Amino acid sequence: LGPQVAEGENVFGVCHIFASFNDTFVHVTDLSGKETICRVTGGMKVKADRDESSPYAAMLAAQDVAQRCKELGITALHIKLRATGGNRTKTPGPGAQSALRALARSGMKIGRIEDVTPIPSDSTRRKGGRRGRRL
Amino acid sequence: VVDPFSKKDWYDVKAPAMFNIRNIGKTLVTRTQGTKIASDGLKGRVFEVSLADLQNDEVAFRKFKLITEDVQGKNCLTNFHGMDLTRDKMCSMVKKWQTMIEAHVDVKTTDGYLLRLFCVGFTKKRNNQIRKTSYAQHQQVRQIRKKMMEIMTREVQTNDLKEVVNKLIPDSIGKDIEKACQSIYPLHDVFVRKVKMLKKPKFELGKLMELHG
Amino acid sequence: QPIKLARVTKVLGRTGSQGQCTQVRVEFMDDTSRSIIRNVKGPVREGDVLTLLESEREARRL
Amino acid sequence: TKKRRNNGRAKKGRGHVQPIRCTNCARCVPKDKAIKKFVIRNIVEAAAVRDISEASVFDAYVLPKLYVKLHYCVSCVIHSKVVRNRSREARKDRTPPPR
Amino acid sequence: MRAKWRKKRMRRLKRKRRKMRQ
RNA sequence: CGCAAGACGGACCAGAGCGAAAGCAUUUGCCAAGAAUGUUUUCAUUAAUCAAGAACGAAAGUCGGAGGUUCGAAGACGAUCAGAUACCGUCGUAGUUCCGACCAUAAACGAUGCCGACCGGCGAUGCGGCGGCGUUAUUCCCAUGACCCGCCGGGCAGCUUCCGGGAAACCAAAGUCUUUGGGUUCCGGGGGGAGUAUGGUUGCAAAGCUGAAACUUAAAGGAAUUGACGGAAGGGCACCACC
RNA sequence: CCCAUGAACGAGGAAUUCCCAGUAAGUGCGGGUCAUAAGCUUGCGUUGAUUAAGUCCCUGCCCUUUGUACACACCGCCCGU
């Protein structure tokens, strides 16, 4: 199982952190991104809908992902943190910071950090009306 | 209990010879199961490697996308597919009291690799300038764009893909563009913003192995 | 869980929702060159020494 | 009665200004009347800087920043306290607060 | 009553009168 | 990792530009147009404003055709609620996009007609021209760009001022007004009834233009002041507040 | 007042009084009412703390700026079926 390399040198995966304001995704994949190692979402670690975007759920997801990756021989991660993008918000959700902190806390090495939020040159109409979300 | 990672093999991905650091990492593929072939599913895989991970020195905000078209001996041999600037880098240059001039060209190398190249430049505030804004007039912007397109076409269409990547590594194209346009409007942060392979010639193993080693 | 020394040199102010803590500047005796900020709980005298688990902690800063 | 000489916008010398949607409520507000903030933020929070820096594979990685432009309508900008009401004389002061 | 809603009410009244008055 | 479609043109982007207004932002090309500036060019009063008449005129809306990503009146469902028929959520029709005809209305606003003269100061900014130490690029002369310092002419604005005005707010015009007359167009005459009725006219329609009266009423309204209150913001205080 | 009567209470949910130095707190005597009368109140002594020398939370007090169509002053004013 895992790679056949010396233990001193790191094996790099890529961690996509899709932190929205509803819940957070921690998704480790191959360097190419085509093959995935583990994906733990904040909604898989809490029972309340309101808590799926909480920092605690993201921390639990990051610990699960880190343990699974260590079980598979990946020791270092490139981070690709994104917000919802498109019409919607361009800022990362509440869980992104806790997810990154818990990834680094469990002994996982961190490589390049990138913001891959989808940004439109310009987009379709945004979901709200011309008066917006009024409540 | 079936673990789907017990049937997956780890291959080492190798960069083309234009970069000092040869290996870029490991990629896992499900072993050959019946008709499905591990090799042909391993092909067409794009790795976005930062330049500082491909050359010992040099900047890290330039990333190269390399595509795997062959796998031999548990090694995936990649090739140039595209190039970009990191999101933070490109966001950091767009300031609010200057003109940003963008050009793009679809130009073919001598090997038949049609590339779309996007160049970006910014007008530079002079060291003794009191005026807050460094805007270029519309004809000046058009002249700068013409110069950028002409230089990009000259640098790509005359030579082959290997030397195109060799000169993209230090972004010499942007440096000569900036030196050329210093006379129309002094430019500030000139980079070939992005490169994509629109169309590539039919695969042959000889050229791929030549680009390696 | 390394433990080092820290002694108060400047009482920066009082923090907390209801005046719980003191944001105070503390120097490490073993280094006598670093000043860090701590929301120390309790009556603090300027010059007291306390053994701490933490050597890099910071709190809400203004 | 007129509260502001510029009517609370920058539309001088043109008829129409294209609208943009508020990032907080998706309200259509003119690009000149919208209240614009440009945040530069460390993608790693101050508490998490130590952990990520210690766990880095490189030396002196200098972490990337995040550049977000937020456009607010007047209601959302007031509720979020980005801007606030001022006295009739302090209203005319366009000088940004120190930073 | 909002002026535009009174205008809409008057428009509806005129339409109803046009329908009834054939 | 690819392919397709239909929208849109971020950041740069500004109290910046252009346009009669509505309005206008990817590259490049073609097409005709335009302001300002420069002018020891030309005509020589050809001008200003404008009943009638005419061109354009956001969005929504109508008819026909194409398209249909997103959003989305109507509608369906889920919530919140005493109730909600609404706000909020999931969908979603017409529509939103384009082509050809219609409509001609907006807080179409600078709530401020156009043309001309005169009456303070200052720093900017956009275009054109003129002048000038010095700094940069064209890797060489001049020139030409990018800066720097001024001047002149239109332009968008800003600050300031016991010009003057105004009920004041405030306005270098909303000044040069009982010391009242530069020219000219539209238009108001207490609040409602009411932009309603009716007639005419336009439109396929929705409706647009024109537009009363009976009757009712002592105020309606403008600006500013002091309080009171605010499900507005920021402070301060008491162990009848907290820690 | 003398005999017998040991029910309930194992320091007790949410909301929650009151307390900084001879104070809280424990403790008895006195004045008020008063046939001689205190589980209440008003004084007094006696014994007698770690309580923190801070902040405004969620408590009131409305000080400044701000909006107002309120001034009988929001228990206001007011629209329509």
Swiss-Prot record, chain A:
Q: According to the UniProt entry, which residue ranges have a biased composition of type Basic residues?
A: 126-135
- Does the UniProt entry include the keyword tRNA processing? no
Q: Which residues form a coiled coil?
A: none
> Which UniProt keywords are given for this protein, alphabetically ordered?
Cytoplasm, Isopeptide bond, Nucleus, Phosphoprotein, Ribonucleoprotein, Ribosomal protein, Ubl conjugation
Main localization, broad class: cytoplasm
- Source domain of life is Eukaryota
Q: Name one Pfam family in it.
A: Ribosomal_S11
Location of the region described as Disordered in the Swiss-Prot/TrEMBL record: 115-135
User: Which pairs of positions does the record mark as disulfide bonds?
Assistant: none
Cellular component (GO) terms are: cytoplasm; cytosol; cytosolic ribosome; cytosolic small ribosomal subunit; extracellular exosome; focal adhesion; membrane; nucleolus
Q: Which residues carry the post-translational modification Phosphothreonine, per the record?
A: T117
Modification sites for Phosphoserine: S123
InterPro entries from the entry?
Answer: Ribosomal_uS11, Ribosomal_uS11_CS, Ribosomal_uS11_sf
Cross-link Glycyl lysine isopeptide (Lys-Gly) (interchain with G-Cter in SUMO2) residue location(s): K45, K47, K90
**Among the record's GO biological process terms, what is one?**
maturation of SSU-rRNA
Signal peptide bounds = none
Question: Recorded GO terms, molecular function?
Answer: mRNA 5'-UTR binding; RNA binding; structural constituent of ribosome; translation regulator activity
Please state where this protein is localized.
Answer: Cytoplasm; Nucleus, Nucleolus
- Give the similarity note: Belongs to the universal ribosomal protein uS11 family.
This chain's function reads: Component of the small ribosomal subunit. The ribosome is a large ribonucleoprotein complex responsible for the synthesis of proteins in the cell. Part of the small subunit (SSU) processome, first precursor of the small eukaryotic ribosomal subunit. During the assembly of the SSU processome in the nucleolus, many ribosome biogenesis factors, an RNA chaperone and ribosomal proteins associate with the nascent pre-rRNA and work in concert to generate RNA folding, modifications, rearrangements and cleavage as well as targeted degradation of pre-ribosomal RNA by the RNA exosome.
Question: What is this protein called in UniProt?
Answer: Small ribosomal subunit protein uS11
Whose protein is this, by species?
Homo sapiens
UniProtKB/Swiss-Prot annotation, chain B:
Q: Is Ubl conjugation given among the entry's keywords?
A: yes
- Pinpoint the Glycyl lysine isopeptide (Lys-Gly) (interchain with G-Cter in SUMO2) cross-link: K14
Using the record's annotations, give every residue carrying the modification ADP-ribosyltyrosine.
Y135
The terms under GO molecular function for this entry are: mRNA 5'-UTR binding; RNA binding; structural constituent of ribosome
Q: Which UniProt keywords apply?
A: Acetylation, ADP-ribosylation, Cytoplasm, Differentiation, Isopeptide bond, Nucleus, Phosphoprotein, Ribonucleoprotein, Ribosomal protein, Ubl conjugation
Protein's job? Component of the small ribosomal subunit. The ribosome is a large ribonucleoprotein complex responsible for the synthesis of proteins in the cell. Part of the small subunit (SSU) processome, first precursor of the small eukaryotic ribosomal subunit. During the assembly of the SSU processome in the nucleolus, many ribosome biogenesis factors, an RNA chaperone and ribosomal proteins associate with the nascent pre-rRNA and work in concert to generate RNA folding, modifications, rearrangements and cleavage as well as targeted degradation of pre-ribosomal RNA by the RNA exosome.
Where it sits in the cell: the answer is:
Cytoplasm; Nucleus; Nucleus, Nucleolus
Record's superkingdom?
Eukaryota
- Name recorded for this polypeptide: Small ribosomal subunit protein eS1
- PTM description: ADP-ribosylated at Tyr-135 by PARP1 in presence of HPF1.
Q: Which residues carry this modification: N6-acetyllysine?
A: K14, K36
Q: Give Gene Ontology CC terms.
A: cytoplasm; cytosol; cytosolic ribosome; cytosolic small ribosomal subunit; endoplasmic reticulum; extracellular exosome; focal adhesion; nucleolus
Question: Has UniProt tagged this entry with the keyword Phosphoprotein?
Answer: yes
Similarity section: Belongs to the eukaryotic ribosomal protein eS1 family.
Please give a single GO biological process term from the UniProt record.
cytoplasmic translation
UniProtKB/Swiss-Prot annotation, chain C:
Naturally occurring in which organism (per UniProt) = Homo sapiens
Protein family per UniProt: Belongs to the eukaryotic ribosomal protein eS28 family.
The record's listing under Pfam families reads:
Ribosomal_S28e
Quaternary structure annotation from Swiss-Prot or TrEMBL: Component of the 40S small ribosomal subunit. Part of the small subunit (SSU) processome, composed of more than 70 proteins and the RNA chaperone small nucleolar RNA (snoRNA) U3.
Q: Which PANTHER family is this protein grouped with? A: 40S RIBOSOMAL PROTEIN S28, SMALL RIBOSOMAL SUBUNIT PROTEIN ES28
Traced from the root, the source organism's taxonomic lineage reads:
Eukaryota, Metazoa, Chordata, Craniata, Vertebrata
Name under which the protein is recorded:
Small ribosomal subunit protein eS28
Cited function? Component of the small ribosomal subunit. The ribosome is a large ribonucleoprotein complex responsible for the synthesis of proteins in the cell. Part of the small subunit (SSU) processome, first precursor of the small eukaryotic ribosomal subunit. During the assembly of the SSU processome in the nucleolus, many ribosome biogenesis factors, an RNA chaperone and ribosomal proteins associate with the nascent pre-rRNA and work in concert to generate RNA folding, modifications, rearrangements and cleavage as well as targeted degradation of pre-ribosomal RNA by the RNA exosome.
Which keywords label this protein?
A: Acetylation, Cytoplasm, Diamond-Blackfan anemia, Endoplasmic reticulum, Nucleus, Phosphoprotein, Ribonucleoprotein, Ribosomal protein
Curated annotation (Swiss-Prot), chain E:
Q: Name one Pfam family in it.
A: Ribosomal_L41
UniProt KW keywords: Cytoplasm, Ribonucleoprotein, Ribosomal protein
Which GO CC annotations does the UniProt entry carry? cytoplasm; cytosol; cytosolic large ribosomal subunit; endoplasmic reticulum
Which positions carry the signal peptide feature in this UniProt record? none
Q: Which domain of life is it from?
A: Eukaryota
Q: Which InterPro entries match?
A: Ribosomal_eS32 (IPR007836)
Positions of disulphide bridges: none
MF term (GO), any: mRNA 3'-UTR binding
The keyword Cytoplasm appears for this protein: yes
Q: Where is this protein localized, as stated in its record?
A: Cytoplasm
Q: Does the keyword Ribosomal protein apply?
A: yes
Annotated spans, Disordered: 1-22
Gene Ontology biological process terms, A to Z: cytoplasmic translation; translation
Q: Provide the function of this protein.
A: Component of the small ribosomal subunit. The ribosome is a large ribonucleoprotein complex responsible for the synthesis of proteins in the cell. Interacts with the beta subunit of protein kinase CKII and stimulates phosphorylation of DNA topoisomerase II alpha by CKII.
The extra comment attached to this record reads:
Initially thought to be part of the large ribosomal subunit. Crystal structures show eS32/eL41 to be a small ribosomal subunit forming a bridge at the interface of the 2 subunits.
Record family assignment = Belongs to the eukaryotic ribosomal protein eS32 family.
State how it assembles: Component of the small ribosomal subunit.
Q: What is the protein name for this chain? A: Small ribosomal subunit protein eS32
- Gene this protein is translated from: RPL41
